């Protein structure tokens, strides 16, 4: 789930998170969920959160997800002594920072959008907070 089909390179720097990036402003809808901390995000967590919102809002409104994994990351399949090059990629990963808006909604009531994002936030590794369109 959630990775590209062609890649120029797959062996990559793990790197660190700067705590800034693009974000803060809601622009696909009227309500959203913001990261409000540092951590690590996977495709299984995004799908578990997608599967959560579809129980609250069902078929109502449209749902936008501006987030997708940042890098391929290498892993080896069993517990092992390191050496003889990097392993292989079975999943991609992203580092998230406090200003990132993760999910956006519009065609739904505010007290339902907040309740659906509370249900989706239970699938995520960090405390998250509700955000509005802020008229601009």
């Amino acid at each position: 789930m959630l990775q590209p089909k062609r890649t120029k390179f797959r062996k990559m720097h793990k790197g660190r998170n700067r705590g800034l990036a693009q974000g803060t402003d809601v622009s696909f809808g009227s309500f959203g969920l913001k990261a409000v901390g540092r951590g690590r995000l996977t495709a299984r967590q995004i799908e578990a959160a997608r599967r959560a919102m579809t129980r609250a809002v069902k078929r109502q409104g449209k749902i936008w997800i501006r987030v997708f994994p940042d890098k391929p990351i290498t892993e080896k399949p069993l517990a092992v002594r390191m050496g003889k090059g990097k392993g292989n990629v079975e999943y991609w990963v992203a580092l998230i920072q406090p200003g990132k808006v993760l999910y956006e909604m519009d065609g739904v009531p505010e007290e339902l959008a907040r309740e659906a994002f509370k249900l989706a936030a239970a699938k995520l590794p960090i405390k998250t907070t509700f955000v509005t369109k802020t008229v601009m």
Binding site: T134, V135, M136
Partner: protein, 94 residues
């Protein structure tokens, strides 16, 4: 949006920006309308509660500077990445 007051600023950048944003003032600018850009400081009282309503961006605003009152419109709004805080704001002349 009924008339608001502002004051001219001369000290600027990073440390002066953070020392202005001390839970009391904000930086702002007025530009365009065939006149030069003006740098101003704004008290936190009204402007934050005004930008809660969409009419703040679709209807003109009257601002007092050096005791004299002029017409402007809101154009851009810079926000803080990890707290609900206002960093800087733009106004265009009318």
């Amino acid at each position: 949006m009924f008339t608001i007051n502002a004051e001219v600023r001369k000290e600027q950048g990073k440390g002066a920006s953070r020392r202005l944003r001390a839970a009391n003032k904000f930086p702002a600018i007025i530009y365009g309308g065939k006149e030069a850009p003006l740098a101003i400081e704004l008290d936190h009282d009204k402007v934050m509660n005004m930008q809660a309503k969409a009419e703040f961006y679709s209807e003109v605003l009257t601002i007092v500077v050096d005791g004299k009152e002029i017409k402007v419109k809101a154009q851009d709004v810079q926000r803080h990445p990890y707290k609900p805080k206002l960093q800087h704001i733009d106004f265009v002349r009318a």
